[PDB]
Structure formats: structure tokens, C-alpha cells
Design a protein around this ligand. Structure first.
Ligand SMILES: [Mg+2]
Ligand SMILES: [Mg+2]
Ligand SMILES: [Mg+2]
Ligand SMILES: [Mg+2]
Ligand SMILES: [Mg+2]
Ligand SMILES: [Mg+2]
Ligand SMILES: [Mg+2]
Ligand SMILES: [Mg+2]
Ligand SMILES: [Mg+2]
Ligand SMILES: [Mg+2]
Ligand SMILES: [Mg+2]
Ligand SMILES: [Mg+2]
Ligand SMILES: [Mg+2]
Ligand SMILES: [Mg+2]
Ligand SMILES: [Mg+2]
Ligand SMILES: [Mg+2]
Ligand SMILES: [Mg+2]
Ligand SMILES: [Mg+2]
Ligand SMILES: [Mg+2]
Ligand SMILES: [Mg+2]
Ligand SMILES: [Mg+2]
Ligand SMILES: [Mg+2]
Ligand SMILES: [Mg+2]
Ligand SMILES: [Mg+2]
Ligand SMILES: [Mg+2]
Ligand SMILES: [Mg+2]
Ligand SMILES: [Mg+2]
Ligand SMILES: [Mg+2]
Ligand SMILES: [Mg+2]
Ligand SMILES: [Mg+2]
Ligand SMILES: [Mg+2]
Ligand SMILES: [Mg+2]
Ligand SMILES: [Mg+2]
Ligand SMILES: [Zn+2]
Lengths: 97, 97, 155, 206, 127, 60, 83, 23, 116
RNA sequence: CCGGGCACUCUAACGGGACUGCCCGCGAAAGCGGGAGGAAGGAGGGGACGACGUCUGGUCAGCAUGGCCCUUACGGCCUGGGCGACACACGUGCUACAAUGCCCACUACAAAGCGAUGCCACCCGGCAACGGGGAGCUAAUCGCAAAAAGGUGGGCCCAGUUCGGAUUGGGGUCUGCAACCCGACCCCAUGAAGCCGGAAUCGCUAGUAAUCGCGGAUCAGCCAUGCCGCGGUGAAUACG
């Protein structure tokens, strides 16, 4: 019954989890509210200049944010209109059983 | 001890030893010439003799430039002498009041 | 430093006597932030100073602190062409530190093998005016005394 | 040389990426590699148009490349013609569903990367660089900006001693995060070397 | 039946559960002293309750997660003082001046590029 | 020795060990991240441009 | 060193030249670029010319120099001391 | 002993295991 | 000359004492005292002339030792040096053997500093 | 562990909150000294951020690039070697010289990250490196995993040692087409210098210094004792 939400942008992650939470709750029935999973973090630490200068760096980060929702009382009025919901570009979705 | 770096140039042990000979002029003042460093290099307009030397009362840091390398080495030594002598006698300048 | 007077850190009283002073002294025993070991050694010492001389660790230690507090010390000040050693009173804050520092330091100069004993013994000796920590005190105080001549040169 | 890129500095505050799409580690590199190839041919052909951004989106083997420009025409072609001629050259590299759109720039004289290229061109055409700069600033201010600043660096006028020239009007607070500051770079080839033009436009604080 | 404080210090967190009893105390599924054995820092964890003569009026069940033994000790100290304030809000005076109510923000300061630790700069010889 | 090298890196090798990463952008052999196909320099340039999805300047 | 489970390593292309010499009745100087090859019990008595990067160095092989590599007996570095 | 491989203390530092530090 | 050729320190625990024989470390020491069944805790000064002869008898026969060990190590280097292999050469100059750097350091092989 | 529940811890998005706002005093004022409230008080601690400019600073070897130069070669491929040399000198560090210590055993408390020819539980062989089995996990589930200093117990007894772990001999394991030059690891043996360091000199003002371990980038392996991070324990002192 699960929809799993992952993206590089967090403000778009609650966009997609705002609507998807609403979609199942409308077309019946129970939704396990959008759960904020812990973020997996990838740091990039790099010497600023092109040549030597080791003691000056610039810090770069990549947040793969994490969300999970459960559609509890499933009820196939839901399972259709989901295959027609508007995904913002920067997120991927996982649905399994 | 005695350290010479010849930057983007080839120099002989002869020349090296000559630098040691000139720098010796500093031994006059009878204070510890600790880990002196002579650097020789060739700008477009002439050579450069840089040097950084630590003594018990401070550091000698100076630079000579001239069409002639040997002359640049000497002009360096002058500046080194002058500074060394300022170190050694500046303390005396205020015994009254 | 340059702007205003810095401020003395209030220490948290020690759980076996609630004494701001034991804490300080503990810390000065502490190498490497191994404060547990620090307290141990100290407490072990007290155990001993009870064992060997049947009276209050706390009362004893506080004396050895009182007997190692240097009252006058020398502070150097070049005037003209000589660096004169000037006599100065030591502010209680510093009296403390020096007392604790020296106490430890003499203690760690002793031949007894284990740290816990040495602290005990030095504390014992200094309550009686014996020991290195008291020697350091007097060396300092004789020094100030000789240089009584240069007292007016003070800041 | 000291100053940070006023773009990367405001990401997620005043400015938003030219590439928004998730991916996993197996793929990220490979997608992006295409995007370098992508912007290469696109910034190549569309320079003529007045190229200001190459916005790029992704879902799965299908991508929305939103080009911005203030001469929408040269991208169109003959009545819908060229736009397609690219989608063929394009999706030959992409190998995939390349939705290639064209967005109008409402004023190239308020879009840094544009203003830059202009001056770079003026100086490639042997114009008085000191003049060009004061002018480009003058225009941007007339086009309603809350502040402007341009920079040209290198063998200006053909000097042997390189030199740095710049001018600015109004405000350009590079330290302020809420300041909206479009930054554009243009690289001017000449017979005697390369100059680097930098453009600064202060649109406004949020 | 039960009193609660949230206790935090460094990376340590302490869920504290006060109950009346003879005065006996537990930490993470074992008796207090069995968990904090030989660590003289302990008895100040129980220190806020001594400040108000509430030593034996209470038992205590506590779980403690994160940090190390002493930070965890500090955590407890906060929470048990915390819980006392809902047990008795007239307990501020004679816990506030004693600084027990407050949480010290002193966290391990970040390691910075170019240094060896947060602040320890690398050694360098001018000449 | 450059283009012949930015080339010899693209091609499949006579042994698996000789596999080495180059920057997909500038060709640089040293300090090349597996994750981007980029060297430390290029990584910085695009990131400053915003041409790196999700990738932003970290401050903690 | 090389794992006992895996082989005793020789470049195959030298072993052949070695084997070919046994049968026909040995022996001539054998140039090689295989400093990595083990000397192998069938190599004894040959004199193999080992490349060091500049020269192919003649090495007569003996029964006491058996498990060693080829390059161990063709020095790569010229050193006569300092000053 | 952090440089004596032949002890526990040694192997924690070298990042390895063995007779003198098992897993 | 107790065991074997060397007089292992009395006053000390027999496990430590046995280490004072060339060719016997912590390990071989642990092993002799099991195989001859004696307490490693006992001081050498406390050994049954029986326990001793056992210790002596086992160790002298189990492992190559004192002079006879050193001879093999010498013989080992002797040959390495004479077949003229690289590890041999490094010995032939008194230099380091195990692929260490020699631009700095390398003092234990070299001897303390030799001024120019 | 299951039923059950989100209270709590947390996870992670959105807010609140501190403003010298109020009190007294000194002040023309800005402010400063001080009290209460409050988690926090006068910038809360830390970060990101670097003016016109300077050093004709650094980089044509990341890249771009004017110009100059090469064209069976100053281009290109490959095998081997070299970048790892060693009378010497300097800079950075690691590990120590020990009892506030070292070894053995049993027993605790982190955080940030990483992981599909990837991390590998658990079982088996082997002193061990590792080998064979083989379960789980696109990973707040499963794994790397043990945190170490610490705590309890036991040995060492001031000795160049049960300090120290360099050097060398021998025996193995793994990666890799390949470990002679020139990898790391394991085990037997070896068991150096070193007894706290001249002239000189570095860091650090608080969760800092000191000490302790864990991760990551790169990466087949690795010369990492380097770098970027993360927590644990946790001081001294500031007259001026
Ligand atoms: Mg550094
Ligand atoms: Mg200079
Ligand atoms: Mg003293
Ligand atoms: Mg947190
Ligand atoms: Mg820390
Ligand atoms: Mg430097
Ligand atoms: Mg090129
Ligand atoms: Mg490789
Ligand atoms: Mg690479
Ligand atoms: Mg590590
Ligand atoms: Mg031995
Ligand atoms: Mg090596
Ligand atoms: Mg070497
Ligand atoms: Mg809730
Ligand atoms: Mg600012
Ligand atoms: Mg170039
Ligand atoms: Mg050029
Ligand atoms: Mg021309
Ligand atoms: Mg090589
Ligand atoms: Mg090198
Ligand atoms: Mg030296
Ligand atoms: Mg190092
Ligand atoms: Mg890794
Ligand atoms: Mg010895
Ligand atoms: Mg000695
Ligand atoms: Mg020893
Ligand atoms: Mg040892
Ligand atoms: Mg000693
Ligand atoms: Mg010292
Ligand atoms: Mg020390
Ligand atoms: Mg030293
Ligand atoms: Mg240590
Ligand atoms: Mg690795
Ligand atoms: Zn690059």
C-alpha cells in the first residue's frame, strides 16, 4: 500500500506529499500522514583555487531528502486518480506492496 | 645550517659556496645566524637574491635585484647587514632616561 | 587582555566535600582531561592522610594550601638598562593557583611510586611547613624580601 | 582575487537552479554529461538569438529544456521550422524525448548574461571599452534596475599592460542575500588576447 | 503516579521518570549505581532533588540515549530538576539560582578547514 | 601529452587495473569525483552556476 | 608475496623460450623485459639478459638464486656514493 | 604502544585485527 | 649458563625470563610453559631443578637458538649478498632492505649523522 | 518480541523567541554598570560571507587564451625503468621515552557518514591475515560496528624494563595481468634510538587547549601517521 517520496529539493518534497496525502484522503479512506524520513547527506569539500592553496576550501552539500506515506484503508477510487497526479520535476516516487 | 634554493635556474657548487662566503660577512656581529635561507632567481630585468634568517633578537628578511647576479647577492647582503645591525643596537637606544 | 578584565570561572563544588578548592586542586592533578582518574588519586590521597595521620583530609589539605600561598612575589620590569626584579603582593586569586600548582608540582617530584601516595605525602608535609611546595613559597618570598629596595618601582 | 560567485551564493534564496531533477548515484553523472553536451550545441546555435538561460527538467528518458531569450524568433525558424531541426540534431544526442521550448526575455537589458555579451561584442568590434561600459550601465538603469555594475579585465584597447575597468550605478550589494542580483559573464576574443566581461544587475530585495 | 523531564547535554538525552518510593533509582534497565559505577561525577545527577530535601520521597525510572556517561549524567540532572517543576511549580526559587533549570548550550565546536581541530592551527616556521 | 590522453582514458584497456577516471568536462586526471564525472575545479564552477541539481553551498 | 593458492608467476612468453631451449639442447643469451618473472627451476644454467630500463643485463642463473625474481639481479639504479 | 602491531592497542590504531586483536 | 647457554634472569616470572633468550619472544615463551606444564607466574628463583630441566630440555630441542640461530641469519644474509640480488645489495652497503625512503631518515640502518 | 498506542526520545519541515524589551543608577544623547523575568542577554556559541585595492602575488600543468615555437616529431602507441635514489640540510607530522603508565580479561556510553561484480550479519576451517559457506539490505528496517579513553578484576615493580617498537631473518594472506625495483596486512623471531630534548620556536581564551576513538572523499590495493568531518572525556589562565 506505500508511496515513498525522495528528492534533492525539500520544499518540492512537501508539495508532492501535500497533494498525495490529500488525494487518498478524499477518495477514501485512511492515510498515514506524510512522515519525514532522515536526510542522507553527501558532502563535497574542495580546494577553492585551481592551483596549490591547500588551506582554503569551499564546502558543498547534496541533500537527498526523505519522505514516506501510507494509504491505510486503500479503496480503489484512490488507486486510479493517483496514476493521474501532477508530479513536480525534482522528485522520484516509489510504490510497492 | 646553510641552505640555498636556486629557482628556475642551474647554479654551480662554486656559486653556492660563494654565497656562503658573502653571507659570512654577517658573522661580524657575533650572534647566532639560525637556519639562514638564500634564494636565487631570475626575473626578466635581472636576478633576485632573497634571504630569510633568524637570529636570537629577530629575523632578517631581505631582497636584492640587479642585472648582475653577483651584484644582486651583494646588495642583498648590505640590506641584511643593515638590519642585523639595527637589531643588535636598537636596544641600547634608550638607556636614558 | 586588552579590553576589560577577564573573569574567574566559578568552579562546581566537589561531590565528596562540596569544596570549590578541592575541585581546583583536582583539576591541576588532571592530565589529558581524565578528571575521573584525577578525583580518584585525590580521594585515595585523603584516604591515606586519614590513615597515616588520624585527622581530617579536608582540614589538612586546606592548611597545606595556606602554607604554600606566597604573599609577596617578584615581577620583572626593565628600567633603563637593567631588568629589575620588583617586589609585589600576590592577589589572592593568584596565591591560590600558585599554591595549587606548586603543591602538585612538588608532589610529582617525590620518589614514592604511585601518584595517589605522593599527593598525600606532599599535602601532609606542607601542613607542617616541610616539603617542596613550601620551599617554592619561601624561595619566592625571600626573593621579594631581598629586593625590598625596588618596591617603589611598582605598578 | 577574492570574491564569491553571486549566483551559487544565493541558490535557494534568491535564485533557483538551471537544472532541477532528482537522480540516484548510478545515474547523476550520466544525465549531467548529456546536459553539458546539451548546453554546448544550444549555447552554440542560440548565441545568435540572445541566449540568457538553459533551464532543464527531467522525469525518465524524457526531458524539458526551457530556453530563455529576448529574440524568440531565431529559435522558432521558418514558421515552426528550426525548433524542430534542433529536436532532430538534439534528440540524436539525447537519444530520447527532447521537449525543446522557447521562453521570451521581457527585457535583455535587465538580464546580466545578456548585457555582458553585448559589451563583449562591442569590444570585439574594436569599440572604446571605457565608453561601452558606462553605456551598458546607463541603459540597464534606464530599464528600471535598482542598480547596475559591469567589469572588463585584460588587454583593454590592446594595451600590453593588462588593466581592469568597471563602472556602477545605484546599489549592488553583493553581501546581501535578499538582494536579487543577476550575474552574467561574457568572454571576448580579440587578435591580441581575451578580455572578461562581468555583468551585475540589481533587480531588487525580497 | 509519574513525573517527567526531558534532559539534554551535548549529544546525550535523558527521559526521566519520577515516582514516589523509598528513594531508589534506575538508569537504562539496570540500577543507577550499577550503570554509573566508579564515576564520581554521578551523585550530582541526583543533586537537584537534594537542593529541595526531596531525596527519598522519590523512586526513578530512567532511559538514557546518546553521548557518553558524563553527558548523560548531566542530562539526567536537568530532567529530574525539570520534572520537579510540574510536581511543584513553587520549586523554581531554590532551583533557578542553583542553575539546575537551565540547559548549557556548550556543544562540541566544529572542526574548520585549515586548522587541525576547531581552533588548533597548524604549526608554521617564518624562518 | 593531452588529447591522446583524454582519449586513452575513454577507451577500454588491455587490463582492468589501467582503468582510470578523467574529468568528463576538462580532462583532468587528478582529484576526480566518481559521483559527478568531474574534477574538484569543474565541480566548483558548475555548482556556482546552479548547473548541479540539489547541490548547494554548505554552512554549519 | 604472491599468494600460495595462485600460481608461481612467469610471463608464459619467457617460459616458452626457456622450454624450447631445453629440448633443442641449450644454450644462447635470452633477452627479456620480464623483471617480474620468477626464476624457475628449469632456468638454471641459462644466462638471461634482463632489461633494467636502459640495458639488457646478463644474469647467469644458479641453483641458489631460484625463487627470486629476474629484476633482482639487474639493478635499476646507478650509485657510486656521494662527494 | 600504538606502534606495536603485536598488541591490542597496536591493532586498533593500524585499523586491523589478528592474534593480538580478534573480532 | 642456565638455559640454553644464557642465564635467564632470576627474580622474574619465568615467562618474561625466557624472553631473555635469543629466539624466544612472548609467544614461544607461552608455548614452552604449556608443553612442559609449569606455572608462568612462578619466579625463576622458585623452580624445581626438575621443572628447570624440563624447561631446558624442551626449549633446546624445539627451537633453533642463541648462537645457532644468529648463524642461520648470518648465513641467510651471507648468501643473499653473494647471489648479488637487490635485497643482497642493500645489505652489501649497510643500507635499508625493505623498500624504505632514504632521502631523509633511514638512521637505524645508516648509523647516527655522518657530516659532509 | 506481539497486540496496541505517538505520549516520550527522535526524525524534519513550518514557526515562536532576545528587542538592551522592562527595572534601578550614571548619561545631552548613542550608550554603559546592574537586577528580574527567561532555555538563552547585551552580537547566545559556531558557520556562510572578504570593500577600493596591494603584493608586475599564485596558476599558460585544470581549463580558456594573444603571441612565440615543433611537424617521420617538441606529435602518437607500447615494453621496461624513473617520479620511491641518499655523504648531507630544512619544514610538517606520527610514535615514544613510561606507574596519572604498560599488558591480559571481563564489562559499559557516541555522533556523522557509507554501502548491488557494495556493505556483509551468522556458521565453518585457520594462532591470524584470510579462506569457504551463507542470511539480510535499492537500506531511520539490513550491514560496515568494535567506539576508544572510561569501569571491574588480575599481572608488571622503576629496571633501556611486561617502557619503546625501529631494524633485520623466516613463514604466510589479499588486491591486482603483475608486488625485483615498489603495496598493504598477519604470525614466529629480531627488540634500535630514545631517560623529556641547545640556540631558537608553534598552538590554543571554553566545551577551547589536551587527550580518545569513529566516518568520508579519492580508491583494485595502498605506502593515510595527510586531508575534510564527527562525537567522547574535559582543564589552566588573562595584573595588565
Ligand atoms: Mg595543511
Ligand atoms: Mg619576495
Ligand atoms: Mg615547585
Ligand atoms: Mg539534533
Ligand atoms: Mg572534540
Ligand atoms: Mg604555509
Ligand atoms: Mg589541451
Ligand atoms: Mg588504478
Ligand atoms: Mg583519477
Ligand atoms: Mg582513520
Ligand atoms: Mg627473546
Ligand atoms: Mg614503504
Ligand atoms: Mg626508497
Ligand atoms: Mg505529537
Ligand atoms: Mg556581513
Ligand atoms: Mg594550457
Ligand atoms: Mg599560450
Ligand atoms: Mg600576427
Ligand atoms: Mg614505475
Ligand atoms: Mg613525488
Ligand atoms: Mg633536523
Ligand atoms: Mg606524518
Ligand atoms: Mg569508501
Ligand atoms: Mg634493550
Ligand atoms: Mg642509550
Ligand atoms: Mg621491552
Ligand atoms: Mg612494547
Ligand atoms: Mg626510568
Ligand atoms: Mg617538552
Ligand atoms: Mg609527555
Ligand atoms: Mg621536542
Ligand atoms: Mg598516548
Ligand atoms: Mg582505500
Ligand atoms: Zn574538470
Amino acid at each position: 500500500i506505500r508511496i515513498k517520496l525522495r528528492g534533492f529539493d525539500h520544499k518540492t518534497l512537501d508539495a508532492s506529499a501535500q497533494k498525495i496525502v490529500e488525494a487518498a484522503r478524499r477518495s477514501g479512506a485512511q492515510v498515514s500522514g506524510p512522515i519525514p524520513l532522515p536526510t542522507r547527506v553527501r558532502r563535497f569539500t574542495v580546494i577553492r583555487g585551481p592551483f596549490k592553496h591547500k588551506d582554503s576550501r569551499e564546502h558543498f552539500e547534496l541533500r537527498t531528502h526523505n519522505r514516506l506515506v501510507d494509504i491505510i484503508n486503500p479503496n480503489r477510487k484512490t488507486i486510479e486518480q493517483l496514476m493521474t497526479l501532477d508530479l513536480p520535476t525534482g522528485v522520484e516516487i516509489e510504490i510497492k506492496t | 645550517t646553510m641552505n640555498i634554493t636556486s629557482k628556475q635556474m642551474e647554479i654551480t657548487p662554486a656559486i653556492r659556496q660563494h654565497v656562503a662566503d658573502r653571507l659570512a660577512k654577517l658573522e661580524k656581529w657575533q650572534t647566532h645566524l639560525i637556519n639562514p635561507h638564500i634564494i636565487l632567481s631570475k626575473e626578466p630585468q635581472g636576478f633576485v637574491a632573497d634571504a630569510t634568517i633568524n637570529t636570537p633578537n629577530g629575523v632578517l628578511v631581505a631582497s636584492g635585484k640587479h642585472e648582475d647576479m653577483y651584484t644582486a647577492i651583494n646588495e642583498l647582503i648590505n640590506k641584511l647587514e643593515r638590519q642585523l645591525n639595527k637589531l643588535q643596537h636598537k636596544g641600547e637606544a634608550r638607556r636614558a632616561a | 587582555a586588552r579590553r576589560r578584565r577577564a573573569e574567574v570561572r566559578q568552579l562546581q563544588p566537589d561531590l565528596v566535600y562540596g569544596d570549590v578548592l578541592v575541585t581546583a586542586f583536582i583539576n591541576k592533578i588532571m592530565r589529558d582531561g581524565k578528571k575521573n582518574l584525577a578525583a580518584r588519586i585525590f580521594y585515595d590521597a585523603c584516604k591515606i592522610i586519614q590513615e597515616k595521620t588520624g585527622q581530617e583530609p579536608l582540614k589538612v589539605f586546606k592548611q597545606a594550601v595556606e602554607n604554600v600561598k606566597p604573599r609577596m612575589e617578584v615581577r620583572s620590569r626593565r628600567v633603563g638598562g637593567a631588568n629589575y626584579q620588583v617586589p609585589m603582593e600576590v592577589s589572592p586569586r593568584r596565591q591560590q593557583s600558585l599554591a595549587l600548582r606548586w603543591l602538585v608540582q612538588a608532589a610529582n617530584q617525590r620518589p614514592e611510586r604511585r601518584a595517589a601516595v605522593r599527593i598525600a605525602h606532599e599535602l601532609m608535609d606542607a601542613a607542617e611547613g616541610k616539603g617542596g611546595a613550601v620551599k617554592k613559597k619561601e624561595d619566592v618570598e625571600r626573593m621579594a624580601e631581598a629586593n625590598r629596595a625596588y618596591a617603589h618601582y611598582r605598578w | 582575487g577574492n570574491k564569491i560567485h553571486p549566483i551559487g551564493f544565493r541558490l535557494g534564496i534568491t535564485r533557483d537552479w538551471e537544472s532541477r531533477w532528482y537522480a540516484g548515484k548510478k545515474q547523476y553523472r550520466h544525465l549531467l554529461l548529456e546536459d553539458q553536451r546539451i548546453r554546448g550545441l544550444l549555447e552554440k546555435e542560440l548565441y545568435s538569438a540572445g541566449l540568457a538561460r538553459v533551464d532543464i527538467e527531467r522525469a525518465a528518458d524524457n526531458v524539458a529544456v526551457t530556453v530563455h531569450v529576448a529574440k524568440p524568433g531565431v529559435v522558432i525558424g521558418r514558421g515552426g521550422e528550426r525548433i524542430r531541426v534542433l529536436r532532430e540534431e538534439l534528440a540524436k544526442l539525447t537519444g530520447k524525448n527532447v521537449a525543446l521550448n522557447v521562453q521570451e526575455v521581457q527585457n535583455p537589458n535587465l538580464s546580466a548574461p545578456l548585457v555582458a555579451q553585448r559589451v563583449a561584442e562591442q569590444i570585439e568590434r574594436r569599440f572604446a571599452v571605457r565608453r561601452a561600459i558606462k553605456q551598458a550601465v546607463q541603459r540597464v538603469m534606464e530599464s528600471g534596475a535598482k542598480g547596475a555594475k559591469v567589469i572588463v579585465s585584460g588587454r583593454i584597447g590592446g594595451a600590453e599592460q593588462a588593466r581592469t575597468e568597471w563602472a556602477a550605478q545605484g546599489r549592488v550589494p553583493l553581501h546581501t542575500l535578499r538582494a536579487n542580483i543577476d550575474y552574467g559573464f561574457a568572454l571576448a576574443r580579440t587578435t591580441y588576447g581575451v578580455l572578461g566581461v562581468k555583468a551585475y544587475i540589481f533587480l531588487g530585495e525580497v | 503516579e509519574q513525573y517527567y523531564g526531558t534532559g539534554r547535554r551535548k549529544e546525550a538525552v535523558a527521559r526521566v521518570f519520577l515516582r514516589p518510593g523509598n528513594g531508589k533509582v534506575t538508569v537504562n534497565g539496570q540500577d543507577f549505581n550499577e550503570y554509573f559505577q566508579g564515576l564520581v561525577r554521578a551523585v550530582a545527577a541526583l543533586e537537584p532533588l537534594r537542593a529541595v530535601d526531596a531525596l527519598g520521597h522519590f523512586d526513578a525510572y530512567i532511559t538514557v540515549r546518546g553521548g557518553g556517561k558524563s553527558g548523560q549524567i548531566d542530562a539526567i540532572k536537568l530532567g529530574i530538576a525539570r520534572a520537579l517543576v510540574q510536581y511543584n511549580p513553587d520549586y523554581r526559587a531554590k532551583l533557578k539560582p542553583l542553575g539546575f533549570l537551565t540547559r548549557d548550550a556548550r556543544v562540541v565546536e566544529r572542526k574548520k578547514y585549515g586548522k587541525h581541530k576547531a581552533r588548533r592551527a597548524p604549526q608554521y616556521s617564518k624562518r | 601529452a593531452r588529447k591522446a590522453l583524454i582519449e586513452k582514458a575513454k577507451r577500454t584497456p588491455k587490463f582492468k587495473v589501467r582503468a582510470y577516471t578523467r574529468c568528463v568536462r576538462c580532462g583532468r586526471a587528478r582529484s576526480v569525483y566518481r559521483f559527478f564525472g568531474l574534477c574538484r575545479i569543474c565541480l566548483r564552477e558548475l555548482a556556482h552556476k546552479g548547473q548541479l541539481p540539489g547541490v548547494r553551498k554548505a554552512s554549519w | 608475496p604472491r599468494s600460495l593458492k595462485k600460481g608461481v608467476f612467469v610471463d608464459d612468453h619467457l617460459l616458452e623460450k626457456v622450454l624450447e631451449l631445453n629440448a633443442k639442447g641449450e644454450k644462447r643469451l635470452i633477452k627479456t623485459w620480464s623483471r617480474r618473472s620468477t626464476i624457475v627451476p628449469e632456468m638454471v644454467g641459462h644466462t638471461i639478459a634482463v632489461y633494467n630500463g636502459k640495458q639488457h643485463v646478463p644474469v647467469y642463473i644458479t641453483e641458489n638464486m631460484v625463487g627470486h625474481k629476474l629484476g633482482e639481479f639487474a639493478p635499476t639504479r646507478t650509485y657510486r656514493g656521494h662527494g | 604502544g600504538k606502534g606495536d602491531r603485536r598488541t591490542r592497542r597496536g591493532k586498533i590504531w593500524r585499523g586491523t585485527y589478528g592474534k593480538y586483536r580478534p573480532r | 649458563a642456565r638455559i640454553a647457554g644464557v642465564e635467564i634472569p632470576r627474580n622474574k616470572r619465568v615467562d618474561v625470563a625466557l624472553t631473555y633468550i635469543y629466539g624466544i619472544g612472548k609467544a614461544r615463551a607461552k608455548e614452552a610453559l604449556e608443553k612442559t606444564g609449569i606455572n608462568p607466574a612462578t619466579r625463576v628463583k622458585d623452580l624445581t631443578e626438575a621443572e628447570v630441566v624440563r624447561l631446558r630440555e624442551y626449549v633446546e630441542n624445539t627451537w633453533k637458538l642463541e648462537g645457532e640461530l644468529r648463524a642461520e641469519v648470518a648465513a641467510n644474509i651471507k648468501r643473499l649478498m653473494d647471489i648479488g640480488c637487490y635485497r643482497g645489495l642493500r645489505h652489501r652497503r649497510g643500507l635499508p632492505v625493505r623498500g624504505q625512503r632514504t632521502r631523509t631518515n633511514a638512521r637505524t640502518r645508516k648509523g647516527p649523522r655522518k657530516t659532509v
